[PDB]
Amino acid sequence: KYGDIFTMKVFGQRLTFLVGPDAHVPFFSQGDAELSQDEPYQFSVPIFGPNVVYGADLAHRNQQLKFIAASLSTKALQSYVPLIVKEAEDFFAKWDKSGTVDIRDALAELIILTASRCLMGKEIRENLFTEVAKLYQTLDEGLLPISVFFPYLPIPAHKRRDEARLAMVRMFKKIIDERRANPEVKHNDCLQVFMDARYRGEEQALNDEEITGLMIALLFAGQHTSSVTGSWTGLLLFEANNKKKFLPGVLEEQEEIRKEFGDELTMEALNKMDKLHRCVKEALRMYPPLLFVMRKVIKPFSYKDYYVPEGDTVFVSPALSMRVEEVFPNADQYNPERFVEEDKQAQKYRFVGFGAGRHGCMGENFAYLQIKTIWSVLLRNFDIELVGELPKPDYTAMVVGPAHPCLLRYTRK
């Protein structure tokens, strides 16, 4: 090894990792001509679709990111937040006087519910959820670690996936054709943002696949990440170790705001919950949901005295580059308040769990707001104690959340 950087050769290709905040500089800051996403992420293509995201050429690609970006902008966010909150308050109402809950599975149910209404609209969410929660998890199920190198191996799962996507397109066929018949009616969701999107040089719009694809992707990104970091934020907090040292800090801020921005719950009020923003952010720092992020190298680049040829595949791990102790004092242990003047730091790419650069996470705030809302509600309506100790990371999966007896128990407030 070096400490900072280390290539392997595995199967065919050779994987050049980076860990340094200096290291990251080439991974997070060169451009689309210099690093490619095409090859490394090509596993997703026939989960999302043809000419969707990584499916499409560079021209049609950069624009779809933009439609997503604008679908998830501060504007559109402010308008989802109402939906996000209500669902949260609606979900946690249903709970008992007192009882156990697998916080992973519960917040997974709850985020997909809200992922439905913001991404696919009222009709999908009100009429068709249980259908579209199957048609998703059938696409999901066609993601095996084989799929990441042969994403078209004729194996039975891939068929079922390809099949389930086709079906989901025809579902939005109906819903979009309905809407294109009454332009009159205004619409608050992503798919509307997409429906109204058009490319440069052409004014026919995106179609009932391309759209559906674009939305599924955001379904994917939601379920594979928010869902877990949601759970981590709380598993860590309500471990007793940390409940003592941090939970007063927390609930004080829950009251301090409560008496200013009311019993009801609005974005203004989330945006300034600066503690819980950190108390979540630290659960990304310690247990990022994506293990690592990849590019094939196009224009080659030296790093120090280490040459990184062409056809390489440069990695960065969140989980690795955020346990560096020359960058995070006390990295082994759960310190929400580290960010209070870490966030004051100048050097780029010290925190990478939401990546950085040209391709940093277009969902960052959506995630936060979804997540903060969940605990924001859960703190006010319950008292939350952990059963067992802090769950172990679960690498036996494509998704990388906490191991599956990862539960709490609630008693009403």
Ligand X SMILES: C[C@@H](c1nc(-c2ccc(C#N)cc2)cs1)[C@](O)(Cn1cncn1)c1cc(F)ccc1F
Site residues (CB under 6 A) for ligand HEM?
A: 65, 68, 72, 218, 221-222, 225-226, 229, 284, 288-290, 293, 353-355, 359-363, 366-367
**Is 410 annotated among the ligand-binding residues?**
no
What DSSP assignment string belongs to 348-408? SSS--TT--GGG--TTHHHHHHHHHHHHHHHHHHEEEEESSSS--B--SSSS--B-SS--E
Minimal distance, residue 244 CB to ligand HEM, in Å: 26
Question: By Cβ distance, which residue is nearest to ligand X?
Answer: 221
Taking contact as CB under 6 A, which single stretch among the options 232-240, 286-294, 334-342, 401-409 is the one that binds ligand X?
Answer: 286-294
15/38 Cα distance (integer angstroms): 16
194-198 CB contacts, 8 Å cutoff, 24+ apart: 194/67, 194/71, 197/63, 197/67, 197/70
Q: Is 137 annotated as a binding residue?
A: no
Which helix (H) or strand (E) covers residue 297, if one does? Answer: strand 293-297
CB of 116 to ligand X, least distance (A): 16
**Least Å distance between CB 157 and ligand HEM?**
24
When binding is defined by CB under 6 A, the residue of 56, 290, 308, 314 that contacts ligand X is: 290
User: For residues 140 and 383, which CB has a smaller minimum distance to ligand X in the complex?
Assistant: 140
Pick from 133, 127, 106: nearest CA to 219: 133
Tell me the torsion sign for CA atoms 128, 167, 401, 249.
Answer: negative
Torsion of CA 67, 343, 273, 383, to 10 degrees: 110
Closer by beta carbon to ligand HEM, 53 or else 257: 53
Sheet holding 35-36, edge to edge: 5-9, 14-18, 313-316, 293-297, 35-36
By the rule CB under 6 A, 220 interacts with ligand X:
yes
**Residue 37 labeled ligand binder:** yes
Residue 58 C-beta: closest distance to ligand X, Å: 15
Angle of CA points 111, 212, 194, to nearest 5° = 90
**Nearest distance from residue 182's CB to ligand HEM, in Å?**
27
Out of 187, 224, 258, 409, which residue is the one contacting ligand X (CB under 6 A)? Answer: 224
Residue nearer to ligand X on the CB measure, 214 or 407: 214
Minimum CB distance to ligand HEM smaller for 191 or for 293: 293
Q: Is 41 in the site for ligand X (CB under 6 A)?
A: yes
Binding site, annotated residues for heme: 361
Interaction site with ligand X (CB under 6 A): 41, 44, 53, 148, 217, 220-221, 224-225, 290, 293-294, 361, 363
